[PDB]
Write a protein that binds this ligand. Structure first.
Ligand SMILES: CCCCCCCC/C=C\CCCCCCCC(=O)O[C@H](COC(=O)CCCCCCCCCCCCCCC)COP(=O)(O)OCCN
Ligand SMILES: CCCCCCCC/C=C\CCCCCCCC(=O)O[C@H](COC(=O)CCCCCCCCCCCCCCC)COP(=O)(O)OCCN
Ligand SMILES: CCCCCCCC/C=C\CCCCCCCC(=O)O[C@H](COC(=O)CCCCCCCCCCCCCCC)COP(=O)(O)OCCN
Ligand SMILES: CCCCCCCC/C=C\CCCCCCCC(=O)O[C@H](COC(=O)CCCCCCCCCCCCCCC)COP(=O)(O)OCCN
Ligand SMILES: CCCCCCCC/C=C\CCCCCCCC(=O)O[C@H](COC(=O)CCCCCCCCCCCCCCC)COP(=O)(O)OCCN
Ligand SMILES: CCCCCCCC/C=C\CCCCCCCC(=O)O[C@H](COC(=O)CCCCCCCCCCCCCCC)COP(=O)(O)OCCN
Ligand SMILES: CCCCCCCC/C=C\CCCCCCCC(=O)O[C@H](COC(=O)CCCCCCCCCCCCCCC)COP(=O)(O)OCCN
Ligand SMILES: CCCCCCCC/C=C\CCCCCCCC(=O)O[C@H](COC(=O)CCCCCCCCCCCCCCC)COP(=O)(O)OCCN
Ligand SMILES: COCC(CCO[C@H]1CC[C@@]2(C)C(=CC[C@H]3[C@@H]4C[C@@H]5O[C@]6(CC[C@@H](C)CO6)[C@@H](C)[C@@H]5[C@@]4(C)CC[C@@H]32)C1)COC
Ligand SMILES: COCC(CCO[C@H]1CC[C@@]2(C)C(=CC[C@H]3[C@@H]4C[C@@H]5O[C@]6(CC[C@@H](C)CO6)[C@@H](C)[C@@H]5[C@@]4(C)CC[C@@H]32)C1)COC
Ligand SMILES: CCCNC[C@@H](O)COc1ccccc1C(=O)CCc1ccccc1
Ligand SMILES: CC(=O)N[C@@H]1[C@@H](O)[C@H](O)[C@@H](CO)O[C@H]1O
Ligand SMILES: CC(=O)N[C@@H]1[C@@H](O)[C@H](O)[C@@H](CO)O[C@H]1O
Ligand SMILES: CC(=O)N[C@@H]1[C@@H](O)[C@H](O)[C@@H](CO)O[C@H]1O
Length: 1118
């Protein structure tokens, strides 16, 4: 047919493809709109027509029903098939939610662009290769969800309820008990500094409600209802949230607040294993799928002219590009000397300096135009780049626009190889890997418009249930930009806090579905891009005495003695909390112990000397460490007795006593090798930190140009939380004219962009996503210069942070991890009890045994033997234990008496089934319960089950203990762990985990030591800090246990902004200096210099230790 040939010619032709691509792109910019005008309706029709034409033009090219089979064989056209079907249905003949379907059109260009379909296809293999670790992750999450459910069932419903005294007449204190104390939130007491209920616990480790507030379980719900441990669904959600570490510290502090501080152990166990280990397993198998597919593709590929003479003679030898790099460095350094309150002459000086720098660059640019050839400038990319910045600078001479000089610092890339490694990464992100980035871009676009069509009217109408008062939420999906922002925040790792609000406004089923799909798919494709970037960038008495001391120092008892003194002295350090003032006996006890310690360590020093020699002593680095610390101690003692004591610097120098635990590093052959292999990689960390400091210098100068001085608030003193209305108070100066009453305080935000240093602090709080909320809120409210912030004026400043997060957090991370990996390779190329652990893992880890047991050949014995052996018996007892698991999942809080009756009956039924299996099994012939470790394991669990049943039988008659039940019942969890015998994936993964826990023990020991040093430092400084955002009555630095809680929390980087926040404040509107402090000190202030030092250094050292050591572990396992 002629129409057949015509349709085929249109099909193969390439102008049709670009026509449909432009049509899709315009339909995209038309989907991304909310509140479309009527002039859009025909446009809809328009698109419909074109797509239908596509359909015809292809099916008329097919021809028949066999051709229709071949056409539908490629699945991609099923999409626009459904698209035109839905179009005809909606245009011929409602819930109004069908409009959400045409976003499928946006996926069409993945099949139209022949490169994108390759990506979205090659991204399918890993998610079905993720199966083994996915079921291991679901299995561990469900195990720990049962554990957490049994431990904390209805614990999060504890509330510091007010005091209720019951009345005689029953059946403003007048009320009813339950209907008033369950649905009444008036009765509860809010947490200090929040509109959030206070939790409590009857235990002596939980929150202590103030006088006048008892503490019960009769409460509304958890925060919005979604953080319960009450059911297995809610508990599985809570443990998923703690696995992804999304706001996990909030659940940590809530649970410890109600359950007790000792359950801290639980949380660390679920972080040291749940978050870290399961997440890292998923990540490592994705990395393995990536390596495998890339090597698979690599294998598939393996299948007047006088004046010309004079000027060219003058420009023969420029030879001064080094002076140009120096002038660039001076230019950035000169731009960096910009701050908030600059004098007029200093501003004029900076302007003249950058003017003369522009002159320098313009002059040598026009010289380089005539130095070689304008075809040379047409040739090289660097020269094009400097030409661009010159034109942009002259445009400046003709807030965002001044910053384009900053790219000049990138000119250092030619001499700073790690900087050009960074730019190679950024050039692959949109170069050789442009398709991955483009796929991610259209996926974020699809998710943004899908979410906005699904949730726009919800977010817009029911906003009253999502914000404080008649006012907007900071995060929503009504506009496309805010939907993109929700998606981007999710990609950053914050999906629970906006999911709560979405489900509060929209609906749990659909919102859960979409946010979990966004998180899974987006984090998967972002990990794909991350890994792809990482892969694309790849007389004799004197001598007699000396040998006497040489004998006295090498004696093992001497070494154990000094180790014990080290440990005792550090433990003595731990006793230095705020309660020594009333501890009179142990005060002087610790005084004498301290002087004994310095004397014994200095005598040890002198004997080391006289034995080994001064050159043999002062060459060892750890001996230098010991000498330095004993020097600290000696000077402290000397100035303590020989006058000039409690004198400023000398009385604050004994704070350095907290370094005393560092003596332990040299002794233990685990910490020593760890610190060796760690400081052996400080040069790489230093050069990468230099590249990151230059990049964040760029971004901090941008933030100082954009909003420096625009972060002030002018809070009203009574309210305190929020700022003020622009209408009423507009300027900082009007904040000082209406200030006839001293309630107005023009405060900055704690972390702002006022210097390059405050810029660096804000960029660290944004790059870790802790504390960035207030940064970005004060930035997208930044109206004027000293002007009061309008609620979302300058809304597009979000872009700044987004861009920074992409270049300063994503790519720099690709830098960090990058060098680390390669660093280790070169170190790869160039505790004896743990060796015995190794040897025993070799010894008793016997895999294949001999013939286990022969048939007893008796009538009953042989029959029971034969019914025990067949694998059908194994699979059915596994089905039985899985049914026990499910009947374990059906337990909730405050369920009912009859249901718990039934559940206890089924409990006895199941322990009976399994103990019958046990009595049949040990009688296999004689030796079933001796050969395999699994049989004796289930033997232990079955006897534990029988003893648990009889303990449940003897609750009160013989002897009673209230809390122990909750843990003996927890032994039932052991039964589900019996499933580890059947599965092969999770068993091998958990065994390879248990093989490496000596290494994790050494790493956790170094981490514990760093926590100990920083706990003592914070006990010295950060006690008496005002109780604010992240420092409550339970997570302090007051005691040592509180310090360990705070520091374990921060070790995951979580909530570190909320703890640094009360260390920064220094003013009367927040602090109270001159406060009658109980100790020698005064004032409840933090000290910003050492607070920033402490927290930034602590999170950076913990990040470095964890990253370095975990990559070492992962490489040594590989
Ligand atoms: C990987 C991803 C992990 C995603 C975790 C999904 C858990 C979502 C939470 C959830 O399941 O919702 C709960 C659903 O509970 C159910 O009955 C459904 C059973 C969940 C099975 C999972 C499918 C909320 O139920 P509720 O009626 O609102 O409770 C009212 C309070 N009395
Ligand atoms: C970094 C990437 C930033 C990409 C999003 C920023 C630009 C989006 C934008 O501002 O336009 C927004 C809409 O953007 C589009 O419609 C184009 C979508 C592509 C404005 O919001 P609105 O209320 O829908 O009108
Ligand atoms: C099924 C789940 C499969 C894999 C789960 C992947 C989980 C790791 C996500 C990989 C992304 C990545 O490495 O870059 C992450 C950061 O990347 C970003 O910030 C993405 C924001 C820019 C959007 C796209 C560029 C690593 O930083 P993080 O704070 O530790 O991650 C927080 C949320 N993951
Ligand atoms: C297994 C996984 C999927 C099985 C079903 C899980 C989610 C079922 C969806 C669902 O129930 O949403 C129901 C309605 O679902 C819809 O509206 C259809 C829209 C979904 C479009 C599909 C787009 C997928 C995103 C890509 C319930 O409606 P609701 O207004 O959210 O509920 C009122 C408040 N409770
Ligand atoms: C090298 C590290 C030095 C080895 C010492 C490790 C911690 C031992 C010091 C903790 C002593 C707690 C002092 C104390 O009980 O004060 C009141 C705190 O008492 C507690 O609550 C128990 C503290 C348990 C922390 C043990 C780790
Ligand atoms: C087999 C399935 C039988 C389901 C028996 C549970 C009936 C409703 C009780 C229930 O859903 O408990 C709720 C827990 O939901 C579950 O049972 C989760 C079960 C996951 C699907 C089956 C996995 C085995 C919480 O209440
Ligand atoms: C390793 C890096 C530790 C950074 C040491 C911070 C030094 C303390 C800064 C300071 O005292 O500023 C005190 C507060 O005054 C300021 O506003 C400047 C703040 C400077 C903070 C700079 C922190 C840089 C951290 C980014 C590292 C990546 C004075
Ligand atoms: C091996 C891995 C490294 C392990 C531990 C690193 C130890 C880091 C020390 C902790 C630093 C904490 C901190 O910055 O707090 C501040 C520390 O002050 C300092 O500047 C001294 C820091 C010297 C630590 C150097 C030790 C290096 C150990 C390497 C091994 C407290 O300020 P203050 O001047 O003592 O108080 C005056 C106010 N009245
Ligand atoms: O073949 C496989 C055999 C097991 C192996 C080598 C691999 C997968 C997970 C691996 C584990 C992820 C855990 O994650 C880690 C890293 C640090 C912690 C976050 C948790 O433990 C490794 C010790 C743990 C691990 C690296 C040890 C080795 C494991 C490959
Ligand atoms: C047929 C020459 C195949 C593989 O050889 C090794 C090469 C290095 C590689 C791929 C592997 C080990 C650790 C790997 C790292 C664990 C880190 O953990 C992560 C988690 C996700 C990141 C956010 C942080 O670092 C990975 C990116 C990081 C990582 C997956 C990146 C890639 C690393 C395997
Ligand atoms: C993408 C992970 C999502 N969940 C974790 C994050 O939320 C924060 O985790 C951390 C908490 C404390 C210190 C460091 C980290 C890290 O990021 C290092 C992870 C890591 C693991 C193994 C090998 C290299 C690096
Ligand atoms: C009566 C009063 O003022 N406060 C009470 C307190 O005495 C009591 O210990 C607590 C719970 O027992 O309930 C509240
Ligand atoms: C920004 C500003 O004007 N702050 C002042 C504050 O320093 C002073 O203590 C108070 C007097 O009550 O008045 C107000
Ligand atoms: C602001 C104000 O009104 N008074 C403060 C005072 O409370 C504070 O102790 C002192 C030192 O910071 O600075 C001033």
């Amino acid at each position: 047919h002629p129409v057949r040939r015509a349709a085929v010619k249109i099909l193969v032709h390439s102008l049709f493809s670009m026509l449909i691509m432009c049509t899709i792109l315009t339909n995209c910019v038309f989907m991304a709109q909310h509140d479309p005008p009527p002039w859009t309706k025909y446009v809809e029709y328009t698109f419909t027509a074109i797509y239908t034409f596509e359909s015809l033009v292809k099916i008329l090219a097919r021809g028949f029903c066999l051709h229709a089979f071949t056409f539908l064989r490629d699945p991609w056209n099923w999409l626009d098939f459904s698209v035109i079907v839905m179009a005809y249905t909606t245009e011929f003949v409602n819930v109004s939610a069908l409009r959400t379907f045409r976003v499928l059109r946006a996926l069409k260009t993945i099949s139209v662009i022949s490169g994108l379909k390759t990506i979205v296809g090659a991204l399918i293999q890993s998610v079905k290769k993720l199966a083994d670790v996915m079921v291991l992750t679901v299995f561990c999450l469900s195990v720990f969800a049962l554990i957490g459910l049994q431990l904390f069932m209805g614990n999060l419903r504890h509330k510091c309820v007010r005091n209720f005294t019951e009345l005689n007449g029953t059946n403003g204190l007048v009320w009813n008990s339950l209907d008033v104390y369950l649905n009444d939130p008036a009765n509860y007491l809010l947490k200090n500094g929040t509109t959030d209920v206070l939790l409590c616990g009857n235990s002596s480790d939980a929150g202590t409600c103030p006088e006048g507030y008892r503490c019960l379980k009769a409460g509304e719900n958890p925060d919005h209802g979604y953080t319960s441990f009450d059911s297995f669904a809610w508990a599985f959600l809570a443990l998923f949230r703690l696995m992804t570490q999304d706001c996990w510290e909030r659940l940590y502090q809530q649970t410890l607040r109600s359950a007790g501080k000792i359950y801290m152990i639980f949380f660390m166990l679920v972080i040291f294993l749940g978050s870290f280990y399961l997440v890292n397993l998923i990540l490592a198998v994705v990395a393995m799928a990536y390596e495998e597919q890339n090597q698979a593709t690599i294998a598939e590929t393996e299948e007047w002219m006088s004046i010309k003479q004079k000027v060219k003679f003058v420009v023969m030898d420029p030879f001064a590009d080094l002076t140009i790099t120096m002038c660039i460095v001076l230019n950035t350094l000169f731009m960096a000397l910009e701050h908030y309150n600059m004098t007029a002459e200093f501003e004029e000086m900076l302007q003249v300096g950058n003017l003369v720098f522009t002159g320098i660059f313009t002059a040598e640019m026009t010289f380089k135009i005539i130095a070689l050839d304008p075809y040379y400038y047409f040739q090289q990319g660097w020269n094009i780049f400097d030409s661009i910045i010159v034109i942009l600078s002259l445009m400046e001479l003709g807030s965002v626009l001044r910053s384009f000089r900053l790219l000049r610092v990138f000119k250092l890339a030619k001499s700073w190889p790690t900087l050009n490694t960074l730019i190679k990464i950024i050039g692959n992100s949109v170069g050789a890997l442009g398709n991955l980035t483009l796929v991610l871009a259209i996926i974020v676009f699809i998710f943004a418009v899908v979410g906005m069509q699904l949730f726009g009217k919800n977010y817009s109408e029911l906003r009253h249930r999502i914000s404080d008062s008649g006012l907007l939420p900071r995060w929503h999906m009504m506009d496309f930009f805010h939907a993109f922002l929700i998606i981007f925040r999710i990609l950053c790792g914050e999906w629970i806090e906006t999911m709560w609000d979405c489900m509060e406004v929209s609906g749990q089923s659909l919102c859960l579905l979409v946010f979990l799909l966004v998180m899974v798919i987006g984090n998967l494709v972002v990990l794909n891009l991350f890994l792809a970037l990482l892969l694309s960038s790849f007389g004799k008495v004197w001598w007699r005495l000396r040998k006497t001391c040489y004998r006295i120092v090498e004696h093992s008892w001497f070494e154990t003695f000094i180790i014990f003194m080290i440990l005792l002295s550090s433990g003595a350090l731990a006793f230095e909390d705020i309660y020594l003032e009333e501890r009179k006996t142990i005060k002087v006890l610790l005084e004498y112990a301290d002087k004994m310690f310095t004397y014994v360590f200095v005598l040890e020093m002198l004997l080391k000397w006289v034995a080994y020699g001064f050159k043999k002593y002062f060459t060892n680095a750890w001996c230098w460490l010991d000498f330095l610390i004993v020097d600290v101690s000696l000077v402290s003692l000397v100035a303590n007795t020989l006058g000039f004591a409690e004198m400023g610097p000398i009385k604050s120098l004994r704070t350095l006593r907290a370094l005393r635990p560092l003596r332990a590093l040299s002794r233990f052959e685990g910490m020593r090798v760890v610190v060796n292999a760690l400081v052996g990689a400080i040069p790489s960390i230093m050069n990468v930190l230099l590249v990151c400091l230059i990049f964040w210098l760029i971004f901090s100068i941008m933030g100082v140009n954009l909003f420096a001085g625009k972060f002030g608030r002018c809070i009203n003193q009574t309210e305190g939380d929020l700022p003020l209305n622009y209408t009423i108070v507009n300027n900082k100066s009007e904040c000082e004219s209406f200030n006839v009453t001293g309630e107005l305080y023009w405060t900055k935000v704690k972390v702002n962009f006022d210097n390059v240093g405050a810029g660096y602090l804000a960029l660290l709080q944004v790059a870790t996503f802790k504390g960035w909320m207030d940064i970005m809120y004060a930035a997208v409210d930044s109206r004027g210069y000293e002007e009061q912030p309008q609620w979302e004026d300058n809304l597009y400043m979000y872009i700044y942070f987004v861009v920074f997060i992409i270049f300063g957090s994503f790519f720099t991370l690709n830098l960090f991890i990058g060098v680390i990996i390669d660093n280790f390779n070169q170190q790869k190329k160039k505790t004896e009890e743990q060796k015995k652990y190794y040897n025993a893992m070799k010894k008793l880890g016997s895999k294949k045994p001999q013939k286990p047991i022969p048939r007893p050949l008796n009538k009953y014995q042989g029959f029971i033997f034969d019914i025990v052996t067949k694998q059908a018996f194994d699979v059915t007892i596994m089905f039985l234990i899985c049914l026990n698991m499910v009947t374990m999942m059906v337990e909730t809080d405050d369920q009912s008496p009859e249901k718990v009756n039934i559940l206890a009956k089924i409990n006895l039924l199941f322990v009976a089934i399994f103990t019958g299996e046990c009595i049949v099994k040990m009688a296999a012939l004689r030796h079933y319960y001796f050969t395999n470790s699994w049989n004796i394991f289930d033997f232990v669990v079955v006897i534990l089950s029988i003893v648990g049943t009889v303990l449940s039988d003897i609750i009160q008659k013989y002897f009673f203990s209230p809390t122990l039940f909750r843990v003996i019942r927890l032994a039932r969890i052991g039964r589900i762990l019996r499933l580890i015998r059947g599965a092969k994936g999770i068993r091998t993964l958990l065994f390879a985990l248990m093989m490496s826990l000596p290494a994790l023990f050494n790493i956790g020991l170094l981490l514990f030591l760093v926590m100990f040093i920083y706990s003592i430092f914070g006990m010295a400084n950060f006690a008496y800090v005002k109780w604010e955002a992240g420092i409550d009555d339970m997570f302090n630095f007051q005691t040592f246990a509180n310090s360990m809680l705070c520091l374990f929390q921060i070790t995951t980087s979580a909530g570190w902004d909320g703890l640094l926040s009360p260390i920064l404040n220094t003013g009367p509107p927040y602090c109270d200096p001159n406060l009658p402090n109980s100790n020698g000190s005064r004032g409840n202030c933090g000290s910003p210099a050492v607070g920033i030092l402490f927290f930034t250094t602590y999170i950076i050292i913990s990040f470095l230790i964890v990253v370095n050591m975990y990559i070492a572990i992962i490489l040594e396992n590989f």
